Amino acid sequence: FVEKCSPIGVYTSGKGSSAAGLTASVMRDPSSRNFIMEGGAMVLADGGVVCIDEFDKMREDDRVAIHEAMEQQTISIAKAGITTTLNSRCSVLAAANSVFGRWDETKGEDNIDFMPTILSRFDMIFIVKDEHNEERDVMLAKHVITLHVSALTQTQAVEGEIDLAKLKKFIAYCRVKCGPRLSAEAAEKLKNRYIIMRSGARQHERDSDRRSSIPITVRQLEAIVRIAEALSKMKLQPFATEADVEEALRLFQVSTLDAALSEDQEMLSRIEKQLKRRFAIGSQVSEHSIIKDFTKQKYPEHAIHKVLQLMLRRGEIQHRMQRKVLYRLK
Amino acid sequence: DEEAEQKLFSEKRVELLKELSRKPDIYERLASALAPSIYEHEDIKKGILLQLFGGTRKDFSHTGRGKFRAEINILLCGDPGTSKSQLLQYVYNLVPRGQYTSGKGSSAVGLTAYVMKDPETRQLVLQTGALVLSDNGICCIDEFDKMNESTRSVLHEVMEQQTLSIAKAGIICQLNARTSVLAAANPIESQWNPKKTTIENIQLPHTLLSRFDLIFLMLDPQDEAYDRRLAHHLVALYDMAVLKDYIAYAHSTIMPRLSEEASQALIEAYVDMRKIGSSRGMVSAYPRQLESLIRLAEAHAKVRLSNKVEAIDVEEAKRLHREALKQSATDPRTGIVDI
Amino acid sequence: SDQVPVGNIPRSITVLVEGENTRIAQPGDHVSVTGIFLPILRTGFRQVVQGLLSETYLEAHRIVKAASIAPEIYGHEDVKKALLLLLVGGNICLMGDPGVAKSQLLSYIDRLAPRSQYTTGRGSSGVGLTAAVLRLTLEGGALVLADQGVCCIDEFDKMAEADRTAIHEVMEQQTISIAKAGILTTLNARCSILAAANPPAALLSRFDLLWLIQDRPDRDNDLRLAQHITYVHQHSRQPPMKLMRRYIAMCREKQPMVPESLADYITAAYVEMRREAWASKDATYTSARTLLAILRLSTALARLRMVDVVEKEDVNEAIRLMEMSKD
Amino acid sequence: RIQETQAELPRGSIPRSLEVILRAEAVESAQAGDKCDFTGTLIVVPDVSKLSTPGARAETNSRVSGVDGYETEGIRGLRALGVRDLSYRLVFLACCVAPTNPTAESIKNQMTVKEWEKVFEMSQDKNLYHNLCTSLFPTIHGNDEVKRGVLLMLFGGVPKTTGEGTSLRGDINVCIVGDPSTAKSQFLKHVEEFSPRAVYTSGKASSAAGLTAAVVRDEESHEFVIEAGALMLADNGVCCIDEFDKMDVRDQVAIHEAMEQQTISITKAGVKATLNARTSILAAANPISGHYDRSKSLKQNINLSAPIMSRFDLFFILVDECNEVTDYAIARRIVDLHSRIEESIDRVYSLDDIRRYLLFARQFKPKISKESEDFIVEQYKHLRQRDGSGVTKSSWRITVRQLESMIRLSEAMARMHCCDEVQPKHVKEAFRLLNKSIIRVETFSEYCRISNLIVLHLRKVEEEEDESALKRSELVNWYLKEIESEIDSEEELINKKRIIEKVIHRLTHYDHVLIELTQ
Amino acid sequence: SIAKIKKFSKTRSKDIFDQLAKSLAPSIHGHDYVKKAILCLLLGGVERDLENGSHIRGDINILLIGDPSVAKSQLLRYVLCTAPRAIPTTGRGSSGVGLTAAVTTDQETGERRLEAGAMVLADRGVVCIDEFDKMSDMDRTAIHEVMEQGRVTIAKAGIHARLNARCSVLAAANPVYGRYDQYKTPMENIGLQDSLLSRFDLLFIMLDQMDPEQDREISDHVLRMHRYRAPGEQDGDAMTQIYEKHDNLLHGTKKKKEKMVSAAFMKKYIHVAKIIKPVLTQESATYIAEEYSRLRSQDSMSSDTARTSPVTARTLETLIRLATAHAKARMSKTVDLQDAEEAVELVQYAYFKK
Amino acid sequence: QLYCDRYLCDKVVPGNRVTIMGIYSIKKFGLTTSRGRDRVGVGIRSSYI
Ligand SMILES: Nc1ncnc2c1ncn2[C@@H]1O[C@H](COP(=O)(O)OP(=O)(O)O)[C@@H](O)[C@H]1O
Ligand SMILES: Nc1ncnc2c1ncn2[C@@H]1O[C@H](COP(=O)(O)OP(=O)(O)O)[C@@H](O)[C@H]1O
Ligand SMILES: Nc1ncnc2c1ncn2[C@@H]1O[C@H](COP(=O)(O)OP(=O)(O)O)[C@@H](O)[C@H]1O
Ligand SMILES: [Mg+2]
Ligand SMILES: [Mg+2]
Ligand SMILES: [Mg+2]
């Protein structure tokens, strides 16, 4: 949808596409001596949006080049008798899969394979999980079937949708027309919040005694700045207000801080640590006994159920002939 | 060319050589006369002489087996601080139709034959390589370890079938490569480490090793008499025609043949060799060693100017085969050479 | 390379040579040529610009082609003596820690020798060594050019295996053999090799002399080295070649000989040396090659003295040099 | 184009190539790959670009000189005097072409009465199966299975086509893997000598264009001509490949394409063409380690791709015994070859007679009888049942490809014996050979059987009841109670009890197959 | 593609390099040592030749290692913009052949021709290498020839040449563990051999310490730069004096007591200083030699801290080179003791870490 | 093959999907003799739009 909506947009996966690379290359024609350059997926877009599936499969050369492409928006290529610098002013929108194939909440870190260097360049990081909600599945199924039924007759799902052509032209118009900048009063509040967030991150790192895989740097501060500026630009205003910065900080918290801080998870870790000691290898325990023991400790039952489900997925816990009593394997 | 014509008018020389052959020590004398400026290694020189004489070129086309290799291939494995290179140089300079290759310097296409086009005329489809130019001659290979598997693939067929098959675009042919190989090799560590076994020291596939008739494991005993003799000889460094005529006459005038006594001696030698080489750690034996024994016996029969191979020749061949590999001093159940 | 401007590439010219001037110059030589600059009228493929164009060429009429070794470098006196002996003649390898000037000694050796070549590594690898066919004539590499001279190789351990095998063949057999598609030749290379490297049995077994340069941080030696370097950088001259070339040329004219009696003495020494090597189980190599190297060094020293008969002092100095190198 | 044969080569010389020209009726004969005698003339034909340097040339005898303004300079003078360069080349014109050594009715008519008598005498001998084995391979000792397989491959099966447009293979492919010096290349050389149309190639010597085909331009006309490769010259013959592992993987891909489609497709130099390659492949390969590992399956001992591995009809494995009496029996033969150059051979049929009989035999296309259908069905059923878990692992695993191979081998046997239909004897022989080719892995059976029985009992207990289960002592007691009718004395009973207890301990602790829980 | 300079130099002396280091790049916050080192590259040493044809290197080389977002690439880009002959060549962007040179057979004539690489084109210039750690080993072995002697030897049968490649190198490499580990010694983090480290004149390590006041300063600077708009451009729109005019945002109210040097005058002064040829004095030679001996003895005394780079003979040449660069900074005729002291301070800071 | 004159040049980039209105014609460079080793075709003029 982003590829279709933006005036300029390229959709690619890792390793490029069918017959087009992800980064540009340079060759020399032997017959007639001309320096030919082949357009890559990044060079072909200027001011557009590049959607990238399968972020994990990239090759080494492209992985190294994308660092400069994301940071300085330029690529530098030198060969015998030639040195060139190409422009690539692209926004990046990437999707990736879990390391183990599905997310493991209790493991926390190590669910992401990317080194912190590449993760630093991103502005916002979203984490999505298949969350168990019995009554939400009914609504999702009904929504899907309603969409399938209504696709045949009327493309009028919502009363006030902007038409795709109108939305495209309006986005282009706003992008070309004006450009906003921050305000000092909002700037000071942003500074204070950023200092507080950095202090909290350092405190979390020192208390947990582990290096954070998703750090908070100056680039994230500039990311919040850029998001606020974009929100201001959406209204054609030359200067932003406090509300824009507040919304930007809310979004930044919801995405990045929830990604980096990944009491519920710590409490689940406590339950796992307790169970590992309590569970006797080569012995059986009734689920009712565990439920009673942990509810007398006043821990929620849903956490215990989720921990048991995760152990079942890992394979340490197995059911007997009757599901009332479980036993421990390795 | 000259051997295939009756140019032995020198009846005086014929009588002199035929009288010399009846003397007992002439064998050793030949081993002495093969190289005056080379050291006490008489076994190596005897092996080279037997290589020079060569086995009988029998005809087996009626059998359908194909060509039978009648020549001798020898290997010398040792540290670089020895005189194997000088031996290869002397053999190259002594025998006509000689070629010399060294390590990675040659390629697979460099040997056999390669496709060309004339710089003066339109075409010259194929041009011979190092091995074919060595047909009916001697090829000396040095630094045999560094050669890649691609060239060893060629050597596998060359060393046994005596023929080469080439099949490329518009070029399908079979060529004759009836050469004799003198190969030199080094230990993997450039030292003969006594803790490792012989096979581990050499590090060559058994298929390639089995085709060598004789293998000489050069070792340093550090004997005082050896040091004194070699020092005196080297510091003191500061009839060829008769040998030539004798070698040509023997090589061109006698066809060795063997009786049942030699047959049974060869069979006994074969079963004894199989018994000895069964134990792991040492180089195992294969049926081609029997043919190697036959070839050495025929060469020794040629040395004595005899058309009949006697049990003496077979016993001498067995002695050389045993001594070359140093199987007597080697520990049969650990594969470690001792002194 | 001195006259090339900044960032450009050397230009080439073509010379034609007449009867007696023929057979004077060889590839790789530095020459001075007295010539006439004349054009050649060219008729051939059509061109953009009308008129009479031509190609230029030069018609020649005449072509013209112990002591201190590298006094700028402080220390290494014994290594300098060994270098002198190698230059005079009858293969030396240096292994050293980084920061010790091994490359500059090889550069000095290249500049001093009449016929010399200097290689730096993979830049001259492959076809830069051995020889290749070009439009047909066969053109040689650095080893071929340095025939009957001295060759210098830097960063020896970083070379490809094929180059090292070729170098070993040159050192031991003194000829190169090439058998590839289009080339089937044996090349004559009667040159002695000096090699430099960073920290194997191959070097000990194949080479004659190895010099290990270890940087032990002694205060006095380091302070003297610092003083020497400051002197060099400030006064542009060491603290207080043509003659050396003439002396070497005069020296190489003679050929001493070994008498019969001294053999016994030499023999005794050799035996005793080996016995000591057999006593010290930590020792690595002794063989007749060491005796040959000692004889060659003694003959070189006798040649330096211009004596017809080898003497005792030369043998003692060769023994001392080998002992110093081994230690 | 013709080439000088190998037997005429002098020392270190490449064979000479010559051009032959056929006119009118003689044009038909002399196909590519033949070995023929020519009778004709040797004739001189002019050439153009031979002389890069001036040579002999012609001119006119008239004493003519130029005139001012028309002086006989270079070009005009040469054109006026009619100067031509005398360049020539040697060309052979053929008037008679014959084979060097010489549609079933046509073959029968070609043979004379004595040749037909010999063929009929050969036809009705059972020893034809035996004597052909010894005739083609007199010197090689043992390995009669390989000889029988090679003969069956030589005779071959019958190709067929279906109504849907598909085609079915009629050829047989054979592979030999063995330890060093087990006469592995001798079979290849003997088949190369015997067959009239056979090509022997090593793995690395032959290039991709050396096989398949090449396309070049005609000298005179605008058309194109095709240079045949090894597979095309061996069409409807045998191709021998030694050192099969050394071939490039892409060359192996091309070989597999030729084995499956039996067609070579060329799209080059403006020419699109399809050519038939109905070859039978005999290949020799070495083990990965240089020796066969008895403890591993065939797929783990050879570096060959799965498709080409499945395409081969028969695999033969040779292993050298260390110190058996055969070492004597081998030696007696080898010296017999050296002591007796030619008198140590007792061939029954000459090679020419065998070639004639093979040519006659390959024409037959026997059908499949009705009883043979059920016999083959039941034999394939038994073969597949052999793969059951009651016996040790085998090197192969049996699929429908084995059934098709059995049918092909039955057709080959019928062709060899010249019978008009496939009969149960041939089916039995093919079944025997295919079973003997299969080798069982040697490392144990009793331990596996006991473990399987215990697993069966425990899982039956688990599945049959939602109630409580048994313990280790209960399992031991149950197994002993079941054995009760099989052990006659207390000593055997206690020994088996100790053995089963140790086995159960190993299963629970070492193998982790069975789980143990506390009270 | 005179009075002002003389007056400014003669009046300022030390303040010349002081302000030049301070006013190197307002867009980058802090890191005085790296600015000093970059200025030393810009000024450079002195090339020297002797009677025997011996060549002595005069170029400087630097390697920076730091945590992400410490603005190493910004520094590289600024050096690219300011330096006259600057070429950027990242790790895997250019291989060993495209770095130095190559030989090609001309099909038109059959002769052999030489094609220059990146380092040969940058004669007496600057090559910037971003992501230096990703470069392969063979490329670094090739760069050895340029870094040691400044020449490239090329040979293929039919032609051989020695091309000039005198050059200076900037390099930035990430730590092996993604982020620099404090407890482990720098040798484990860098993961480079001693020879390559000795090839470089300077090593620097940069860290992102999360001090609340330092973070406040960084945020202030970044947002001041962000809010700034070019004069003469209307708000909301889309898209020579020696000392720069004071700016309310780019400089600040407190900085009114000092000023920054204009870019154009800075370039002119840099060129003039690069022209000037200073000479070493007798006062400082013994002083530098004694301090080199002191460092090589302190090798045993430095027990509380580890060493980033080994101390070899190249360190003394580096000392002299940095002294001459500082003497170039302030236009004069001879090298004095203060330049030696500054060089030694730089060496002490770079060569050891806590 | 298409012929473009004057202002029609550079209006189309390779890879575009275009609809073109034109005149179907043949080249006219005199009555030249056929070339090459193939001379089967008689009276064939190369066509274009
Ligand atoms: N003994 C010495 N005397 C004078 N200068 C030295 C000495 N040892 C080293 N140097 C200096 O140190 C540098 C060593 O660099 P280089 O010789 O290239 O090292 P390597 O040869 O080990 O690569 C040289 O530039 C040289 O000026
Ligand atoms: N069973 C056998 N009978 C007769 N000769 C044999 C036998 N096995 C081996 N040989 C002899 O040993 C040699 C084996 O070499 P070869 O068959 O080329 O080995 P491979 O084919 O494994 O490379 C042949 O020359 C053959 O004469
Ligand atoms: N000291 C500093 N002063 C100003 N901005 C900085 C500083 N350090 C980091 N930044 C900001 O952080 C970003 C770092 O990006 P980059 O230079 O690519 O980091 P790296 O080169 O370490 O990957 C820059 O956009 C820069 O604006
Ligand atoms: Mg060096
Ligand atoms: Mg074989
Ligand atoms: Mg960066």
Residue numbers in the entry:
A (entry chain 5): 393 to 654, 667 to 734
B (entry chain 4): 433 to 670, 683 to 783
C (entry chain 7): 241 to 305, 337 to 361, 376 to 420, 427 to 490, 508 to 548, 556 to 642
D (entry chain 6): 207 to 308, 321 to 661, 717 to 792
E (entry chain 3): 269, 281 to 518, 542 to 656
F (entry chain 5): 246 to 294
Publication excerpt:
Eukaryotic DNA replication begins with the loading of the MCM replicative DNA helicase as a head-to-head double hexamer at origins of DNA replication. Our current understanding of how the double hexamer is assembled by the origin recognition complex (ORC), CDC6 and CDT1 comes mostly from budding yeast. Here we characterize human double hexamer (hDH) loading using biochemical reconstitution and cryo-electron microscopy with purified proteins. Although both yeast and humans use the ORC, CDC6 and CDT1 to load an MCM double hexamer around double stranded DNA, our work shows that there are clear differences in how the two organisms accomplish this feat.
We solved a 3.1 Å resolution cryo-EM structure of the hDH. Forty-five base pairs of DNA could be clearly resolved inside the two MCM rings, although the length of the central channel is compatible with protection of 75 bp of DNA, as shown by DNA footprinting. The pre-sensor 1 (PS1) pore loops, which emanate from the ATPase modules, are arranged in a staircase configuration that follows the DNA double helix. PS1 pore loops of MCM7, MCM4 and MCM6 engage in minor groove contacts with residues that will form the translocation strand upon replisome activation and the h2i pore loops more loosely follow a staircase pattern and engage both strands. The zinc fingers of the N-terminal B domain form a 13 Å passage that is too narrow to accommodate B-form DNA where the two MCM rings dimerize. For the two DNA strands to traverse this tight pore, 5 bp of the double helix becomes underwound and one base pair is broken. The resulting orphan bases are each stabilized symmetrically by R195 and L209 in MCM5. The neighbouring base is also stabilized by R195 through a cation–π interaction.
